[PDB]
Scaffold this active site. Structure first.
Site, short mmCIF file in Angstrom:
data_model
loop_
_atom_site.label_atom_id
_atom_site.label_comp_id
_atom_site.label_asym_id
_atom_site.label_seq_id
_atom_site.Cartn_x
_atom_site.Cartn_y
_atom_site.Cartn_z
N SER A 42 -1.77 3.71 -4.88
CA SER A 42 -0.38 4.11 -4.83
C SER A 42 -0.16 5.59 -4.64
O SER A 42 1.02 6.01 -4.45
CB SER A 42 0.42 3.62 -6.07
N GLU A 138 1.61 -2.78 0.15
CA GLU A 138 1.34 -3.24 -1.22
C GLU A 138 1.30 -4.78 -1.25
O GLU A 138 2.11 -5.45 -0.61
CB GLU A 138 2.43 -2.72 -2.17
#
Length: 260
Positions: A42, A138
């Site tokens: 991330s 993601e």
């Protein structure tokens, strides 16, 4: 002393630690595996948001555009966007959630708004980053798969310095980005745990499914120039929870090297 201490830390941790840190006052650096590849996880959200901020210069009103999405878009970690499926969120609000809460659905929405994962790559290429690559969204970007979705500690520092401290962005985009990073809520046990009280930190964390744990940051000590750093970790033990305290330990090494 610092690279020896980092090698000792890595031996204690059991795995691979990648560190690079730059003191923008002295110009001094600290590094361990600074040229090796790691999954960004991330931490790549930093660049997705930066790419949105640059894109706004060619798309008048982009930050205020309201994006509608659906239940299928909502992922397991979507702390903000899971609450607004009926009503949408603006691009600005998605940048906020993506950086401050690491909202995965927020990230994916923004990637779609840009035109796909390679648009963020085009952005970093425009900064002179020829090392980083972006490939997936993601949560698949957290899964090692060749060298997809990788960078190096040193490259991440170069990019963070350019974006937070220099002219990678216009000054209002730099302020937007920097404030979101200063206001991160997911980094308290990582770089921030090692930094003295009251010193401002801008950071973005990342983590994988096999204990991989990352953090990138800018730190502003009083009365001196800021420090930019990255700590990327991959435990040999895939169930390890040692990544965050290992990051803090590496940070303490770095800060001591920089007289802080």
């Amino acid at each position: 002393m610092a690279p020896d201490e980092l090698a000792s830390l890595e031996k204690d941790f059991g795995g691979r630690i990648g560190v690079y840190a730059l003191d923008t006052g002295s110009g001094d650096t600290v590094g361990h595996r600074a040229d090796e590849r790691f999954l960004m996880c991330s931490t790549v959200k930093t660049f997705i948001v930066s790419a949105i901020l640059r894109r706004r210069l060619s798309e008048p009103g982009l930050l205020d555009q309201r994006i509608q999405y659906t239940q299928s878009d909502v992922l397991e970690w979507a702390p903000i966007t899971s609450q607004h499926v009926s009503t949408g969120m603006t691009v600005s609000e998605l940048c906020d959630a993506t950086l401050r809460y690491s909202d995965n659905t927020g990230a994916n929405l923004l990637i779609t708004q840009l035109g796909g994962p390679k648009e963020t790559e085009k952005f970093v290429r425009s900064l002179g980053d020829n090392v980083t690559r972006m490939d997936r969204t993601e949560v698949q970007l957290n899964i090692p798969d060749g060298d997809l979705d990788t960078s190096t500690p040193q490259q991440l520092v170069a990019n963070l310095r350019r974006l937070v401290l220099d002219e990678g962005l216009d000054s209002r985009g730099r302020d937007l980005l920097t404030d979101w990073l200063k206001r991160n809520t997911t980094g308290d046990q990582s770089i921030r745990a090692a930094v003295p009280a009251g010193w401002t930190v801008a950071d973005k964390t990342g983590g994988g499914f096999k204990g991989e744990t990352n953090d990138i940051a800018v730190i502003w000590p009083p009365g001196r120039a800021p420090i930019v750093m990255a700590v990327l970790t991959v435990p040999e033990d895939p169930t390890s929870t040692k990544g965050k305290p290992t990051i803090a330990a590496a940070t303490r090494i770095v800060l001591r090297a920089f007289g802080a």
